[PDB]
PDB file of N, CA and C in Angstrom:
ATOM      1  N   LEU A 950       0.881  -1.575   0.355  1.00  0.00           N
ATOM      2  CA  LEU A 950      -0.221  -0.115  -0.131  1.00  0.00           C
ATOM      3  C   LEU A 950       0.852   1.207  -0.124  1.00  0.00           C
ATOM      4  N   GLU A 951       0.485   2.407   0.088  1.00  0.00           N
ATOM      5  CA  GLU A 951       1.489   3.341  -0.292  1.00  0.00           C
ATOM      6  C   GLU A 951       2.432   3.637  -1.462  1.00  0.00           C
ATOM      7  N   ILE A 952       2.116   3.034  -2.030  1.00  0.00           N
ATOM      8  CA  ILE A 952       3.043   3.061  -3.411  1.00  0.00           C
ATOM      9  C   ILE A 952       2.731   2.440  -4.721  1.00  0.00           C
ATOM     10  N   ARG A 953       0.967   2.290  -4.911  1.00  0.00           N
ATOM     11  CA  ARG A 953       0.146   1.775  -5.691  1.00  0.00           C
ATOM     12  C   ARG A 953      -1.049   2.213  -5.397  1.00  0.00           C
ATOM     13  N   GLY A 954      -1.338   3.220  -4.267  1.00  0.00           N
ATOM     14  CA  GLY A 954      -2.294   3.326  -4.027  1.00  0.00           C
ATOM     15  C   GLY A 954      -3.059   2.136  -3.201  1.00  0.00           C
ATOM     16  N   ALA A 955      -4.393   2.338  -2.527  1.00  0.00           N
ATOM     17  CA  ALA A 955      -4.890   1.237  -1.760  1.00  0.00           C
ATOM     18  C   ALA A 955      -6.398   1.432  -2.375  1.00  0.00           C
ATOM     19  N   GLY A 956      -7.101   0.624  -3.766  1.00  0.00           N
ATOM     20  CA  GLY A 956      -8.077   0.131  -4.548  1.00  0.00           C
ATOM     21  C   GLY A 956      -9.772   1.272  -4.021  1.00  0.00           C
ATOM     22  N   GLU A 957     -10.548   1.252  -4.719  1.00  0.00           N
ATOM     23  CA  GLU A 957     -11.625   1.918  -4.652  1.00  0.00           C
ATOM     24  C   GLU A 957     -12.477   1.259  -3.327  1.00  0.00           C
ATOM     25  N   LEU A 958     -12.606   1.792  -2.994  1.00  0.00           N
ATOM     26  CA  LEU A 958     -13.629   1.586  -2.286  1.00  0.00           C
ATOM     27  C   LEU A 958     -15.023   0.494  -2.333  1.00  0.00           C
ATOM     28  N   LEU A 959     -15.646   0.840  -3.013  1.00  0.00           N
ATOM     29  CA  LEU A 959     -16.951   0.422  -3.487  1.00  0.00           C
ATOM     30  C   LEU A 959     -16.696  -0.035  -5.208  1.00  0.00           C
ATOM     31  N   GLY A 960     -15.865  -0.536  -5.663  1.00  0.00           N
ATOM     32  CA  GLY A 960     -15.803  -1.299  -6.778  1.00  0.00           C
ATOM     33  C   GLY A 960     -14.642  -2.807  -6.779  1.00  0.00           C
ATOM     34  N   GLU A 961     -14.127  -2.882  -7.702  1.00  0.00           N
ATOM     35  CA  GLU A 961     -13.020  -4.051  -8.124  1.00  0.00           C
ATOM     36  C   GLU A 961     -11.995  -2.947  -8.120  1.00  0.00           C
ATOM     37  N   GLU A 962     -10.477  -4.511  -8.274  1.00  0.00           N
ATOM     38  CA  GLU A 962      -8.825  -3.153  -8.449  1.00  0.00           C
ATOM     39  C   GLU A 962      -8.925  -2.652  -7.198  1.00  0.00           C
ATOM     40  N   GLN A 963      -8.414  -3.587  -6.451  1.00  0.00           N
ATOM     41  CA  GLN A 963      -7.479  -4.422  -5.128  1.00  0.00           C
ATOM     42  C   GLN A 963      -6.930  -2.784  -5.333  1.00  0.00           C
ATOM     43  N   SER A 964      -5.721  -2.663  -6.135  1.00  0.00           N
ATOM     44  CA  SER A 964      -4.792  -1.697  -6.228  1.00  0.00           C
ATOM     45  C   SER A 964      -5.037  -0.854  -7.152  1.00  0.00           C
ATOM     46  N   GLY A 965      -5.322   0.523  -6.840  1.00  0.00           N
ATOM     47  CA  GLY A 965      -4.881   1.512  -7.888  1.00  0.00           C
ATOM     48  C   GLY A 965      -5.246   2.808  -6.889  1.00  0.00           C
ATOM     49  N   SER A 966      -4.814   4.348  -6.997  1.00  0.00           N
ATOM     50  CA  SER A 966      -5.491   5.255  -6.378  1.00  0.00           C
ATOM     51  C   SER A 966      -6.567   5.714  -6.697  1.00  0.00           C
ATOM     52  N   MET A 967      -7.528   5.335  -8.559  1.00  0.00           N
ATOM     53  CA  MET A 967      -8.287   5.994  -9.156  1.00  0.00           C
ATOM     54  C   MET A 967      -8.905   6.635  -8.469  1.00  0.00           C
ATOM     55  N   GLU A 968      -9.034   7.376  -7.698  1.00  0.00           N
ATOM     56  CA  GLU A 968      -9.417   9.465  -7.528  1.00  0.00           C
ATOM     57  C   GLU A 968     -10.788   8.228  -6.952  1.00  0.00           C
ATOM     58  N   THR A 969     -11.204   7.549  -6.102  1.00  0.00           N
ATOM     59  CA  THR A 969     -12.034   6.593  -5.570  1.00  0.00           C
ATOM     60  C   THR A 969     -13.655   7.698  -4.862  1.00  0.00           C
ATOM     61  N   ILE A 970     -14.424   7.227  -4.216  1.00  0.00           N
ATOM     62  CA  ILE A 970     -15.651   7.628  -3.828  1.00  0.00           C
ATOM     63  C   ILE A 970     -14.305   7.848  -1.864  1.00  0.00           C
ATOM     64  N   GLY A 971     -14.791   8.945  -1.325  1.00  0.00           N
ATOM     65  CA  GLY A 971     -14.489   9.412   0.265  1.00  0.00           C
ATOM     66  C   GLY A 971     -14.676   8.402   1.206  1.00  0.00           C
ATOM     67  N   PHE A 972     -14.109   7.788   2.223  1.00  0.00           N
ATOM     68  CA  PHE A 972     -14.345   6.353   2.972  1.00  0.00           C
ATOM     69  C   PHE A 972     -15.611   7.252   4.052  1.00  0.00           C
ATOM     70  N   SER A 973     -15.112   9.160   3.993  1.00  0.00           N
ATOM     71  CA  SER A 973     -16.796   9.750   5.386  1.00  0.00           C
ATOM     72  C   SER A 973     -17.544   9.796   4.356  1.00  0.00           C
ATOM     73  N   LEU A 974     -17.795   9.626   2.702  1.00  0.00           N
ATOM     74  CA  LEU A 974     -18.688   9.414   2.112  1.00  0.00           C
ATOM     75  C   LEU A 974     -19.130   8.361   1.945  1.00  0.00           C
ATOM     76  N   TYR A 975     -18.245   7.488   2.139  1.00  0.00           N
ATOM     77  CA  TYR A 975     -18.549   6.189   2.014  1.00  0.00           C
ATOM     78  C   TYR A 975     -20.033   5.372   2.398  1.00  0.00           C
ATOM     79  N   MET A 976     -19.559   5.740   3.758  1.00  0.00           N
ATOM     80  CA  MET A 976     -19.688   5.502   5.283  1.00  0.00           C
ATOM     81  C   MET A 976     -21.205   5.812   5.255  1.00  0.00           C
ATOM     82  N   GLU A 977     -21.839   7.110   4.225  1.00  0.00           N
ATOM     83  CA  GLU A 977     -22.547   7.849   4.566  1.00  0.00           C
ATOM     84  C   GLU A 977     -23.297   7.452   3.790  1.00  0.00           C
ATOM     85  N   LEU A 978     -23.121   7.128   2.142  1.00  0.00           N
ATOM     86  CA  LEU A 978     -24.226   6.149   1.373  1.00  0.00           C
ATOM     87  C   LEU A 978     -24.370   5.268   2.184  1.00  0.00           C
ATOM     88  N   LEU A 979     -23.229   4.135   2.684  1.00  0.00           N
ATOM     89  CA  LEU A 979     -23.711   2.392   3.810  1.00  0.00           C
ATOM     90  C   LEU A 979     -24.716   3.397   4.088  1.00  0.00           C
ATOM     91  N   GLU A 980     -24.930   4.075   5.475  1.00  0.00           N
ATOM     92  CA  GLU A 980     -26.104   4.188   6.562  1.00  0.00           C
ATOM     93  C   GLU A 980     -26.716   4.282   5.835  1.00  0.00           C
ATOM     94  N   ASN A 981     -27.224   5.005   4.788  1.00  0.00           N
ATOM     95  CA  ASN A 981     -28.687   5.630   3.589  1.00  0.00           C
ATOM     96  C   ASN A 981     -29.332   4.169   3.746  1.00  0.00           C
ATOM     97  N   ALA A 982     -28.522   3.561   2.801  1.00  0.00           N
ATOM     98  CA  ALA A 982     -28.387   2.343   2.130  1.00  0.00           C
ATOM     99  C   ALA A 982     -29.577   1.222   2.723  1.00  0.00           C
ATOM    100  N   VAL A 983     -28.401   0.996   4.320  1.00  0.00           N
ATOM    101  CA  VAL A 983     -28.913   1.227   5.480  1.00  0.00           C
ATOM    102  C   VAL A 983     -30.544   1.121   6.448  1.00  0.00           C
ATOM    103  N   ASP A 984     -30.574   2.132   6.157  1.00  0.00           N
ATOM    104  CA  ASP A 984     -31.201   2.625   7.048  1.00  0.00           C
ATOM    105  C   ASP A 984     -32.956   2.478   5.447  1.00  0.00           C
ATOM    106  N   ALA A 985     -32.438   3.417   4.568  1.00  0.00           N
ATOM    107  CA  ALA A 985     -33.671   3.083   3.361  1.00  0.00           C
ATOM    108  C   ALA A 985     -34.108   1.661   3.827  1.00  0.00           C
ATOM    109  N   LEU A 986     -33.082   0.248   3.789  1.00  0.00           N
ATOM    110  CA  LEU A 986     -33.421  -0.806   3.120  1.00  0.00           C
ATOM    111  C   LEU A 986     -34.248  -1.387   4.351  1.00  0.00           C
ATOM    112  N   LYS A 987     -34.129  -1.377   5.668  1.00  0.00           N
ATOM    113  CA  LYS A 987     -34.626  -1.999   6.877  1.00  0.00           C
ATOM    114  C   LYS A 987     -35.753  -0.405   7.286  1.00  0.00           C
ATOM    115  N   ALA A 988     -35.916   0.240   6.126  1.00  0.00           N
ATOM    116  CA  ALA A 988     -37.187   0.983   6.129  1.00  0.00           C
ATOM    117  C   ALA A 988     -38.784   0.668   6.365  1.00  0.00           C
ATOM    118  N   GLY A 989     -38.112  -0.522   5.339  1.00  0.00           N
ATOM    119  CA  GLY A 989     -39.597  -1.151   5.286  1.00  0.00           C
ATOM    120  C   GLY A 989     -39.808  -2.492   5.171  1.00  0.00           C
ATOM    121  N   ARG A 990     -38.507  -3.649   5.209  1.00  0.00           N
ATOM    122  CA  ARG A 990     -38.220  -4.728   4.892  1.00  0.00           C
ATOM    123  C   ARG A 990     -37.847  -4.748   3.823  1.00  0.00           C
ATOM    124  N   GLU A 991     -37.100  -4.226   3.246  1.00  0.00           N
ATOM    125  CA  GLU A 991     -37.096  -4.467   1.510  1.00  0.00           C
ATOM    126  C   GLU A 991     -35.989  -5.822   1.596  1.00  0.00           C
ATOM    127  N   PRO A 992     -36.711  -6.925   0.536  1.00  0.00           N
ATOM    128  CA  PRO A 992     -36.040  -7.910   0.117  1.00  0.00           C
ATOM    129  C   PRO A 992     -34.961  -7.574  -0.873  1.00  0.00           C
ATOM    130  N   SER A 993     -33.971  -8.503  -0.602  1.00  0.00           N
ATOM    131  CA  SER A 993     -32.278  -8.556  -0.361  1.00  0.00           C
ATOM    132  C   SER A 993     -32.142  -8.823  -1.986  1.00  0.00           C
ATOM    133  N   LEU A 994     -31.735  -7.541  -3.066  1.00  0.00           N
ATOM    134  CA  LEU A 994     -31.092  -7.646  -4.682  1.00  0.00           C
ATOM    135  C   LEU A 994     -30.808  -8.773  -4.758  1.00  0.00           C
ATOM    136  N   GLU A 995     -30.212  -9.573  -4.508  1.00  0.00           N
ATOM    137  CA  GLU A 995     -29.460 -10.427  -4.341  1.00  0.00           C
ATOM    138  C   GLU A 995     -30.790 -12.025  -4.631  1.00  0.00           C
ATOM    139  N   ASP A 996     -31.718 -12.104  -4.090  1.00  0.00           N
ATOM    140  CA  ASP A 996     -32.761 -13.152  -3.678  1.00  0.00           C
ATOM    141  C   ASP A 996     -33.328 -12.336  -5.469  1.00  0.00           C
ATOM    142  N   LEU A 997     -33.707 -10.846  -6.283  1.00  0.00           N
ATOM    143  CA  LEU A 997     -34.169 -10.919  -6.903  1.00  0.00           C
ATOM    144  C   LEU A 997     -33.245 -10.828  -8.226  1.00  0.00           C
ATOM    145  N   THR A 998     -31.579 -11.549  -7.758  1.00  0.00           N
ATOM    146  CA  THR A 998     -31.086 -12.361  -8.971  1.00  0.00           C
ATOM    147  C   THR A 998     -31.432 -14.064  -9.070  1.00  0.00           C
ATOM    148  N   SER A 999     -32.229 -14.339  -8.328  1.00  0.00           N
ATOM    149  CA  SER A 999     -31.999 -15.558  -7.814  1.00  0.00           C
ATOM    150  C   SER A 999     -33.890 -16.016  -9.063  1.00  0.00           C
TER     151      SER A 999
ATOM    152  N   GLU B  16       3.115  49.226  12.976  1.00  0.00           N
ATOM    153  CA  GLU B  16       2.017  48.599  13.775  1.00  0.00           C
ATOM    154  C   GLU B  16       3.388  47.289  14.691  1.00  0.00           C
ATOM    155  N   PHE B  17       4.250  47.503  14.226  1.00  0.00           N
ATOM    156  CA  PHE B  17       5.123  46.240  14.916  1.00  0.00           C
ATOM    157  C   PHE B  17       6.662  47.189  15.076  1.00  0.00           C
ATOM    158  N   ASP B  18       7.127  46.288  15.985  1.00  0.00           N
ATOM    159  CA  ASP B  18       8.799  47.588  16.101  1.00  0.00           C
ATOM    160  C   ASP B  18      10.288  46.110  16.111  1.00  0.00           C
ATOM    161  N   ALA B  19       9.368  45.101  16.100  1.00  0.00           N
ATOM    162  CA  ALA B  19      10.929  44.439  16.682  1.00  0.00           C
ATOM    163  C   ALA B  19      10.338  42.501  15.850  1.00  0.00           C
ATOM    164  N   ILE B  20      10.856  41.482  16.209  1.00  0.00           N
ATOM    165  CA  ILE B  20      10.493  40.417  16.062  1.00  0.00           C
ATOM    166  C   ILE B  20      11.207  39.089  16.854  1.00  0.00           C
ATOM    167  N   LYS B  21       9.997  38.182  16.712  1.00  0.00           N
ATOM    168  CA  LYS B  21      10.959  37.285  18.118  1.00  0.00           C
ATOM    169  C   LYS B  21      10.620  36.087  17.384  1.00  0.00           C
ATOM    170  N   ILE B  22      12.014  35.242  17.016  1.00  0.00           N
ATOM    171  CA  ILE B  22      11.811  33.722  17.082  1.00  0.00           C
ATOM    172  C   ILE B  22      11.968  33.051  18.567  1.00  0.00           C
ATOM    173  N   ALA B  23      11.387  32.041  18.106  1.00  0.00           N
ATOM    174  CA  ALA B  23      11.729  31.410  19.496  1.00  0.00           C
ATOM    175  C   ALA B  23      11.151  29.815  19.039  1.00  0.00           C
ATOM    176  N   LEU B  24      11.505  28.250  19.868  1.00  0.00           N
ATOM    177  CA  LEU B  24      10.431  27.556  19.827  1.00  0.00           C
ATOM    178  C   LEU B  24       9.223  27.517  19.839  1.00  0.00           C
ATOM    179  N   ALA B  25       8.442  26.426  19.827  1.00  0.00           N
ATOM    180  CA  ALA B  25       7.257  25.893  19.736  1.00  0.00           C
ATOM    181  C   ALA B  25       6.456  25.763  20.541  1.00  0.00           C
ATOM    182  N   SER B  26       6.061  26.335  21.171  1.00  0.00           N
ATOM    183  CA  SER B  26       5.254  24.880  22.417  1.00  0.00           C
ATOM    184  C   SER B  26       4.293  24.171  21.980  1.00  0.00           C
ATOM    185  N   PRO B  27       4.345  22.877  22.210  1.00  0.00           N
ATOM    186  CA  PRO B  27       2.161  22.550  21.858  1.00  0.00           C
ATOM    187  C   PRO B  27       1.266  23.377  22.118  1.00  0.00           C
ATOM    188  N   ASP B  28       1.671  24.211  23.252  1.00  0.00           N
ATOM    189  CA  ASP B  28       0.110  24.873  23.987  1.00  0.00           C
ATOM    190  C   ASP B  28       0.078  25.928  22.545  1.00  0.00           C
ATOM    191  N   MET B  29       1.206  26.324  22.188  1.00  0.00           N
ATOM    192  CA  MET B  29       1.189  27.409  21.535  1.00  0.00           C
ATOM    193  C   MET B  29       0.410  27.287  20.005  1.00  0.00           C
ATOM    194  N   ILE B  30       0.728  26.039  19.827  1.00  0.00           N
ATOM    195  CA  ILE B  30       0.641  25.251  18.569  1.00  0.00           C
ATOM    196  C   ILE B  30      -0.865  25.341  18.341  1.00  0.00           C
ATOM    197  N   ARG B  31      -1.446  24.805  19.519  1.00  0.00           N
ATOM    198  CA  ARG B  31      -2.617  24.455  19.625  1.00  0.00           C
ATOM    199  C   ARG B  31      -3.743  25.905  19.218  1.00  0.00           C
ATOM    200  N   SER B  32      -3.158  26.827  19.803  1.00  0.00           N
ATOM    201  CA  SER B  32      -3.379  28.416  20.507  1.00  0.00           C
ATOM    202  C   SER B  32      -3.685  28.940  18.621  1.00  0.00           C
ATOM    203  N   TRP B  33      -2.638  28.576  18.163  1.00  0.00           N
ATOM    204  CA  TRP B  33      -2.766  29.086  16.795  1.00  0.00           C
ATOM    205  C   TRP B  33      -3.639  27.760  15.785  1.00  0.00           C
ATOM    206  N   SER B  34      -3.591  26.917  16.279  1.00  0.00           N
ATOM    207  CA  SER B  34      -5.231  26.317  14.918  1.00  0.00           C
ATOM    208  C   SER B  34      -6.320  26.478  15.389  1.00  0.00           C
ATOM    209  N   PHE B  35      -7.368  26.109  14.257  1.00  0.00           N
ATOM    210  CA  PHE B  35      -8.563  26.793  15.289  1.00  0.00           C
ATOM    211  C   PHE B  35      -9.461  24.982  14.195  1.00  0.00           C
ATOM    212  N   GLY B  36      -8.167  23.970  14.741  1.00  0.00           N
ATOM    213  CA  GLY B  36      -9.003  23.009  14.803  1.00  0.00           C
ATOM    214  C   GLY B  36      -8.462  21.451  14.021  1.00  0.00           C
ATOM    215  N   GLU B  37      -7.818  20.375  13.623  1.00  0.00           N
ATOM    216  CA  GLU B  37      -7.014  19.672  14.346  1.00  0.00           C
ATOM    217  C   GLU B  37      -7.603  18.234  12.420  1.00  0.00           C
ATOM    218  N   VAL B  38      -6.820  18.037  11.321  1.00  0.00           N
ATOM    219  CA  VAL B  38      -7.501  17.129  10.874  1.00  0.00           C
ATOM    220  C   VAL B  38      -7.059  15.425  10.574  1.00  0.00           C
ATOM    221  N   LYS B  39      -7.513  15.192   9.866  1.00  0.00           N
ATOM    222  CA  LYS B  39      -7.884  13.598  10.200  1.00  0.00           C
ATOM    223  C   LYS B  39      -7.720  12.972   9.336  1.00  0.00           C
ATOM    224  N   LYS B  40      -7.775  13.074   7.945  1.00  0.00           N
ATOM    225  CA  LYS B  40      -8.432  12.139   7.076  1.00  0.00           C
ATOM    226  C   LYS B  40      -7.230  12.905   6.362  1.00  0.00           C
ATOM    227  N   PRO B  41      -7.034  12.270   5.433  1.00  0.00           N
ATOM    228  CA  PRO B  41      -5.946  12.427   3.790  1.00  0.00           C
ATOM    229  C   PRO B  41      -6.665  13.465   2.393  1.00  0.00           C
ATOM    230  N   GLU B  42      -7.736  12.475   2.665  1.00  0.00           N
ATOM    231  CA  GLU B  42      -8.863  13.059   0.985  1.00  0.00           C
ATOM    232  C   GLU B  42      -8.845  14.606   0.630  1.00  0.00           C
ATOM    233  N   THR B  43      -8.235  15.041  -0.652  1.00  0.00           N
ATOM    234  CA  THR B  43      -8.248  16.686  -0.982  1.00  0.00           C
ATOM    235  C   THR B  43      -9.437  17.043  -1.147  1.00  0.00           C
ATOM    236  N   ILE B  44     -10.159  16.139  -2.141  1.00  0.00           N
ATOM    237  CA  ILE B  44     -11.127  16.933  -2.804  1.00  0.00           C
ATOM    238  C   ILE B  44     -12.578  16.203  -3.210  1.00  0.00           C
ATOM    239  N   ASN B  45     -13.455  16.066  -2.900  1.00  0.00           N
ATOM    240  CA  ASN B  45     -14.029  14.673  -3.921  1.00  0.00           C
ATOM    241  C   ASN B  45     -14.421  15.163  -5.175  1.00  0.00           C
ATOM    242  N   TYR B  46     -14.499  15.789  -5.848  1.00  0.00           N
ATOM    243  CA  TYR B  46     -13.692  16.306  -6.992  1.00  0.00           C
ATOM    244  C   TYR B  46     -14.966  16.068  -7.887  1.00  0.00           C
ATOM    245  N   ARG B  47     -16.564  15.248  -7.974  1.00  0.00           N
ATOM    246  CA  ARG B  47     -17.629  15.603  -7.913  1.00  0.00           C
ATOM    247  C   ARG B  47     -18.200  16.402  -7.863  1.00  0.00           C
ATOM    248  N   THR B  48     -18.601  15.805  -5.937  1.00  0.00           N
ATOM    249  CA  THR B  48     -18.823  17.923  -6.068  1.00  0.00           C
ATOM    250  C   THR B  48     -17.811  18.245  -5.160  1.00  0.00           C
ATOM    251  N   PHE B  49     -18.059  20.207  -5.778  1.00  0.00           N
ATOM    252  CA  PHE B  49     -16.146  20.056  -5.475  1.00  0.00           C
ATOM    253  C   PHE B  49     -16.091  21.198  -4.148  1.00  0.00           C
ATOM    254  N   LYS B  50     -17.533  20.557  -4.021  1.00  0.00           N
ATOM    255  CA  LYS B  50     -16.767  20.536  -2.059  1.00  0.00           C
ATOM    256  C   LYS B  50     -15.866  20.153  -1.629  1.00  0.00           C
ATOM    257  N   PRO B  51     -15.136  20.800  -0.655  1.00  0.00           N
ATOM    258  CA  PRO B  51     -14.192  19.826  -0.226  1.00  0.00           C
ATOM    259  C   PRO B  51     -14.415  18.733   1.102  1.00  0.00           C
TER     260      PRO B  51
END
């Protein structure tokens, strides 16, 4: 790390600078998904795959 | 407005008095929203 850049927190490409999503913004988007998800018991997208 | 200059070592108390906060995270600019 810190010679290649730790990769984007919300994508592929584990190594790279990439000008990613900021981690504080990452956490905010995450918790927004959390309470919007548990807001009314929303079925997980994965079984919408299945 | 002033008459002399003084140089000295900086005590941690004076560095805290100079500073109006303290930085935690290394990210510069979001650059999608240009707010810092």
